[PDB]
Amino acid sequence: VPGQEETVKNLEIFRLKMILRLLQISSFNGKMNALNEVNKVISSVWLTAERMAEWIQQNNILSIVLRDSLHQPQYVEKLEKILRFVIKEKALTLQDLDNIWAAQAGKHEAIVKNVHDLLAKLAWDFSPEQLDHLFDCFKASWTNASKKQREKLLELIRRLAEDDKDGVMAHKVLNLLWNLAHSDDVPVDIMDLALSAHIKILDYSCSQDRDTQKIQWIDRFIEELRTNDKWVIPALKQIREICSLFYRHDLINQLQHNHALVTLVAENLATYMESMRLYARDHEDYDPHVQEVQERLNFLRFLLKDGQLWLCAPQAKQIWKCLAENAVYLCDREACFKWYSKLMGDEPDLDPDINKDFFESNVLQLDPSLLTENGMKCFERFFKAVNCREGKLVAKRRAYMMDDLELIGLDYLWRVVIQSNDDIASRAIDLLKEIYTNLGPRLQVNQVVIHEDFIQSCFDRLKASYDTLCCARQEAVRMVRVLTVLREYINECDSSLHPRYISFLWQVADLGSSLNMPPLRDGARVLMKLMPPDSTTIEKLRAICLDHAKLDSLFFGPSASQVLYLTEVVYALLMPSSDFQFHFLKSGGLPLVLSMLTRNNFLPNADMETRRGAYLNALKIAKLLLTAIGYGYMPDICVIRAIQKIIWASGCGSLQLVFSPNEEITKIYEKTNAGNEPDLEDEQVCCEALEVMTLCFALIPTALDALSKEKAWQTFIIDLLLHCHSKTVRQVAQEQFFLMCTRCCMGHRPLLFFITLLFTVLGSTARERAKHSGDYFTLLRHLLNYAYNSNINVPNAEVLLNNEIDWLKRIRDDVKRTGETGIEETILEGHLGVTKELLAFQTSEKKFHIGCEKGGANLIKELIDDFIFPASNVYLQYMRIPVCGSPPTINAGFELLVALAVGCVRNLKQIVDSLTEMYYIGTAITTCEALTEWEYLPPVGPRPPKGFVGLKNAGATCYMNSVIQQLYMIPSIRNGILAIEGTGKTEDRKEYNIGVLRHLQVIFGHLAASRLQYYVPRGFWKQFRLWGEPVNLREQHDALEFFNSLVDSLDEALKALGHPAMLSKVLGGSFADQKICQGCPHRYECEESFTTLNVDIRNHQNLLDSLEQYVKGDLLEGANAYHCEKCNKKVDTVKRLLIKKLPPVLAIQLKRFDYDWERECAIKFNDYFEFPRELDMEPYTVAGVAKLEGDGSTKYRLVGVLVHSGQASGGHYYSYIIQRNGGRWYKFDDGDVTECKMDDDEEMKNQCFGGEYMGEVFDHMMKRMSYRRQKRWWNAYILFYERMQDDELIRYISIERSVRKQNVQFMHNRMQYSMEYFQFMKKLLTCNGVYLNPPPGQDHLLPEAEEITMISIQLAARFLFTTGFHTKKVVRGSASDWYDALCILLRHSKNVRFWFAHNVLFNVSNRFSEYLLECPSAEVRGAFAKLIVFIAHFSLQDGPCPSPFNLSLSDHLLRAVLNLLRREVSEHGRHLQQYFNLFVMYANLGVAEKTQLLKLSVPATFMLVSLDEGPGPPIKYQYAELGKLYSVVSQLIRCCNVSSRMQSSINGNPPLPNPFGDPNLSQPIMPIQQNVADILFVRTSYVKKIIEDCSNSEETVKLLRFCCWENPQFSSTVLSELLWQVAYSYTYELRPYLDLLLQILLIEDSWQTHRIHNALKGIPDDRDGLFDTIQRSKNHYQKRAYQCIKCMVALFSNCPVAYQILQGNGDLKRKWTWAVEWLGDELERSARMTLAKACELCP
């Protein structure tokens, strides 16, 4: 209705009222609809934009909306357009803006950032009053902002600036940024944050209003730091960052025209350094300074890199002389030196003129006493740059090579080296040596002048320093440094002439000991040594020696250090010079060297080292002097006393007490605070004096006899054997005491005296030391052995043996009582050795009354079952701690047992009986079995002591064993599981869980007490089934599934047995899933039990970030907002997971695996992840979050790292575990447990931290290099953390047999296959060897020898053919020795040989096959073959042996070996060498053996073999080496008569006798057998076989030479085959054929001419023969033609018969001429010599 107008406005106002009340409705949906309809009506807008603006203003619509709706981004997005509509007609006021800014006062972060992005989007349309009002509001917030508040305000400001479309508002934005970054009330973090904000605002907003003010803003910054109120550093880095991006190369010049930075910053540095120095005099009690000076320096450096500017002198002056030269803090000087180091690297920046100015002006003017390491490199580069510009040095490759001598800098570099500390002096010395030693062109001809001038000037400086001494201490350092200069200078010279040079240095070294300066003497002596001997001294000594031959003052000069040097040069002359010895001995040599040692006034003012060196040199001289005079008297007793006192003093490290009354030296020997250890140079003095004493006693024997009665020469030996140190000295002393008593004694009394002396210190001093007795016992053993072997009778032997026996019994009683020896290992080994050596001095009635006697002390029994085999006795008891633990002690016990067994059959019998019943009674009762493995060791391992027990891997079982290791290593688990007693379809699952617990108990006990290296889990693999389905041992699976199944099964087993869930309590945790809503105060909490902690790995880099992700949780918003069951609406909710209960042990999983749908397979992620050793879980727990928001330890230590290495489908698992010890990490992989070096962080990064790295790849035989990015596919998978035997886990709520058995079996088997056991076996078998010889007038063994042989052969057979030869080479040890022992036993006895054959070779029916063919060891097969040959040889004289299925044992052995040829030989190729080698050896023995082989038709059967057609199948291995077969055939055939097949080529002439039969054979064994002739001469297969295959052999040529003699048919066949081989064969194997043909052509029988005719020409009209092959090979394959020509040259030059054939047949001469002409032409285009000899035979 047109007349209804006011009602239209009334209804519009009512609609406004209803909408406003709808906004007032607390329901968000009502406010949602009201906001939507407000947006709708505003967009459609009698209603203009003014009236809605007012209505919003007075009603404060925004105020109601802003109070709650700001928590949702969509509400802000909707309100944005309403705010824009309000603003665009100037309706928003400051109070409304204040309310907008009041929204961030104490509100949540989401609301604050919502307000911020709203303001950022609205800032474009705000009026200037609104914006600057917002700006001082920002400043007011800045006044009270927190740390996060300040950074979010900066983010808001950057949002505002980025959205600035027109660069007008950014002016005030940057003004505020400058105000904030230059306000000192705000910490340094917000400083750099605001600076970065400013820089990024100026960088990428360059669309408009950024350029052309860059200069304006940078000039504003320059003017800002042009005044000094601490604006300098921030403005400086501002300008530095602006110039980093913002044309730049000419920009520096533009800012150099009128606003120079380098100069202005130079004045800044100067006027600020002086400002600090103003208060540095009174306020010095503070600390550095560094932060600002380094920043300004780095500004200068970055600015002066690419601007192409030259640093002028004035600013260089003002920044060098005023900055560091006159400074306060030493760090400023460091900064300046690092500056002048970096500035001039490889390129000048100050121009050569200015450098040559300032370096000489003030850099060299600096006092070297104040200069540091950076100064060294800067000063070096200053030299190099300055000197290489003037034209004095050349850079060359690296070293700045010298071309001048008058340096401008060396004048004060000497001042630097003379006045500095150690490091600066070392650098200066390096500079001087690298500048002086290397001389190049234009000066390379002047070595002598420069070196001499340097040495002379430097020695003059040394003298100038020297004259001041007579302030003292530092000049010593001056001398040391200058002598270091000398020593280095000569060090680089090699890679003197002036006598004054050593004459001054003598006095220099003399002063070194005068005022007691160590380095002076050492440096002087080193310089003297590193020098050729002085020319004057050597000629003077030689002239004096010549004068006196046709000198005391020379070696007794009053200067101290010159005597030592003169002794050094003397020893240099003696030791290579051949003439000077005779001169030295003649004049005064021996007497003066000895009086050198026995006098008191040798060297009054002597140093601790001067006497040492002088002595040691005189001793080395006297050793060779006595060695020379040995072959052919001056030494006396006083010389011995002097040398012994010298050794007394030197063994104490107290050579200065070499004039002691000999009681004090004993006093410091007797454990005087352990401060008398001999040095590394007293050792040589002691040793050399020992050889001197030995040689002197060799000269004079009677002195040592007289020394025995003295109290000295008794304490001397005791001290040097027990009370001394430096084990090498003791070893030398014992060796040479033994040498003295062996050779120098010339009697038996000294041996008895030393033996008695050594035996009286056993219980007194040999036990007190207990560690130095290893050589005292060595002397005891050696002296006793020598006394036995030399038929010397020790007086008191039986009583000492009884004492040793009682001591051993006491030791065994101590071991039985406790389990540990009360002594050391050396004492036990030495006592066992002494008991062994004392055992030789008894008859056979003794050594049997000790061991094996009914009433004696049955020492064999206690030995066997208490020292060596207690474990074997335990094992024997089962089948119904050893005293000798260390391998040396076991060896000593073995030696004692052998010494008991030697010479006594009644002791060997019992030892053998015990050994058989303990090891070889199980199977070796009728036959000897085998291990079926031919290189056998116990495959279990030793289990090193400090290590642990691993677990066997079947190939894919790592994800069980690693988890089991990790679970066991937790002490609570290992204590709890083993303590659960009584463990030995619901019921089926209950029994399954019980079995799980029982198997875990068994494996835990095994790992706790097994002595093997690892364990192989039968029951573990048999019992467990994964999720019911059986576990496949060859199938890879995730370790997490197995861990979950195992922990669930163990918890079920514990619950079913009434025990608490220990695994759940220790490892399991519980998450507290919390849901907190933003629009309503409703909160939801629940508990979720878990066992392993899962952390994201792809999107996280460290464990801390992953754990903080749980605290942050996830936010549900929009369509994904959580629906509240109470409010019945969707609202934003923060879903976070917090740990409620903290387990003592925490398991954390790394989610490094996922699935790829494109690849249709599991994939592995190897992203770089981090985890610390110590973890603080408190911030991530419920308590920590509650404490932070404001409404039982929490720290954990990493102890176990499960690591995966390989593909996701496969891969390998292992562990890294900390062992809980009271005073570490270990490597747990499968059955191996080893130490690891992962404690370092770099190893942690390399091994388990994973990640990508820039790998280096080497390929193409180390000639190609490439860089490839590689991923660490080996990385950690689960992390175990331990918090910092619990009765609760054992308290109720609702077997050690297998370990012992397997330990005992392991010990028994390990003892069986020990190396020491094999040496013991060798000793036992080879002992009694001197008793096994027959009587001289008889050829059979006496009763005792026969019994010993029988017992030894029985035990040797059992041992060897059960486990001896099958053991691997390392332990079994060169079975040739076993063969030698078997030979020693077997010979000289017929019954023993028959027993061995019958019981070892003829009762298994497989011995020969397995030991000759099936054995994959050349040495074992060879030893067995040689043994068979031995037995066959020595059983020929024996009677007829019974047949083992008038035949001797040799016949049976040969038949048995030949029976292998029926089927066994043609199965075992690559192993046939030793079989036919056995046949070779047997023939070589003699004529009877050859006859025996021939009567067996061995040659015929052997010839058939290698041509198939044999007794059995052909050999399957086609590449069979049958050389020894051909050798046997050749040797056997050559011992036969072939005279039937001979023709002399002249009618009526008888054939010549054959010279090529077997030598050392009087007459042929028999006429050649028909079956042999049929294969040799009638048939041609064997000849071809041996020609084509048996090449280079010495037997094939012998056989062919023997058979071809006077045999036209055989010679024809051989020649045909040889010519075929010469023509049609490879040229690399033609030399053997040509050599064999040459040897055939040299047979000087009556067919030689025919053979030569048929070889040179060939078979007529067949184009074969040497000439035919030469003609064919002239064009191609010329090497064959050359080799044929060489063979013909040899034939013509070595055969007189085949030179008349050539000379006498014109056609052959023509062919030879053609051949030699071809060879000459080819060589014109060894060969040269062959061609030279070719036409010396030409006519």
From Swiss-Prot:
Induction: By growth factors. The active site is at C958 (nucleophile), H1212 (proton acceptor). One of its GO terms (biological process) is positive regulation of TORC2 signaling. Residues 949-1284 form the USP domain. GO terms for molecular function: co-SMAD binding; cysteine-type deubiquitinase activity; cysteine-type endopeptidase activity; cysteine-type peptidase activity; deubiquitinase activity; K11-linked deubiquitinase activity; K48-linked deubiquitinase activity; K63-linked deubiquitinase activity. The keyword Cell cycle applies. Belongs to the peptidase C19 family. Deubiquitinase involved both in the processing of ubiquitin precursors and of ubiquitinated proteins. May therefore play an important regulatory role at the level of protein turnover by preventing degradation of proteins through the removal of conjugated ubiquitin. Specifically hydrolyzes 'Lys-11'-, followed by 'Lys-63'-, 'Lys-48'- and 'Lys-6'-linked polyubiquitins chains. Essential component of TGF-beta/BMP signaling cascade. Specifically deubiquitinates monoubiquitinated SMAD4, opposing the activity of E3 ubiquitin-protein ligase TRIM33. Deubiquitinates alkylation repair enzyme ALKBH3. This is Ubiquitin carboxyl-terminal hydrolase 9X. It comes from Homo sapiens.
